């Protein structure tokens, strides 16, 4: 399931140190952290750059926004997003509510 390892994935940089449980928590987080996400602005499936924990940048449209420490959007953060970015859903609802 990984490029050269079966389960350790990104935590392979730790070798046999720190314990299975610790390296497993790291792998669970970093698979999402270093994977591809959707830009909140341009909706492109791109690998966003984390400038620092909580700061994310889109290399396609230049959108720089505040997010989670390790993922661009936390579970609770998703429900209280700015509505200048939920323009697709406002138009989708209206289109269903008009035709």
């Amino acid at each position: 399931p990984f490029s050269h390892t079966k389960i350790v994935g990104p935590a392979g940089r730790y070798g046999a140190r720190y314990g299975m449980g610790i390296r497993r928590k790291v792998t669970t987080i970093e698979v999402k952290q270093r994977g591809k996400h959707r830009c909140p602005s341009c909706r492109s499936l791109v690998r966003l750059e984390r400038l620092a924990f909580g700061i994310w940048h889109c290399p396609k449209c230049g959108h720089t926004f505040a997010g989670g420490a390790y993922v661009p959007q936390t579970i609770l953060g998703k429900t209280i997003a700015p509505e200048e970015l939920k323009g697709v859903e406002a138009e989708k609802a209206k289109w269903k509510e008009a035709a």
Binding site: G87, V88, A90, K92, K94
Partner: protein, 98 residues
């Protein structure tokens, strides 16, 4: 009305201008009949199209999807922020105006 099916008809039968830069040129220099803008267009692009289409007297329909979804609705493998309908060949894409 299915927007996507009618857009593909307008592209293949009539004349459709695809892309923000070419749409702006059509508004400023040509006489488009309808301009379609994706819902997640950047603020600078939306205001530019809104301003130019107003001075040109051309209606704007905001597509209910992203620029990625507008491209798929036009059967294109790329994003489409905005497109201008100059000739509705055999579709009624102008039904989106009202």
């Amino acid at each position: 009305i299915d927007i996507g099916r009618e857009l593909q008809v307008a592209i293949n039968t009539g004349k459709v201008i695809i892309g923000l830069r070419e749409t702006k040129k059509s508004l400023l220099t040509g006489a488009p009949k309808l301009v379609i803008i994706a819902a997640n267009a950047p603020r600078w692009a939306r205001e530019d199209i809104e301003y130019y289409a107003k001075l040109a007297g051309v209606p704007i329909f905001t597509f209910p999807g992203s620029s990625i979804e507008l491209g798929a609705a036009a059967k294109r493998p790329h994003k489409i922020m905005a497109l201008a309908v100059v000739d509705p060949g055999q579709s009624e894409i102008l039904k989106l105006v009202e």
